[PDB]
Amino acid sequence: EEIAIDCHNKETEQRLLQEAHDLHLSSLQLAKKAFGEFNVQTAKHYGNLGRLYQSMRKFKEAEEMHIKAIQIKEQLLGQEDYEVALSVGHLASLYN
């Protein structure tokens, strides 16, 4: 995604963003099958999917991904934590 964000070609950006979509969804499935829905790593993949959705111009469900990640990060790891801060930073960047 970061190569796709930092490149000028539209076709290359679309192809690499779709590739990152496949990798993120596969990683999320692996984490969900191994650990479960409510765990830190599943929230990591949710936040990554939210950033990627913000990159693929799909802002509708990027917000859903970001609150989905935050509601698992701040629950298990406490309201104030590093990864909670990183996820709310992504959410704020998506908003503004």
Partner: peptide, 7 residues
């Protein structure tokens, strides 16, 4: 740019 690093 436009966001922070991925978790």
């Amino acid at each position: 740019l436009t966001r922070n690093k991925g978790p």
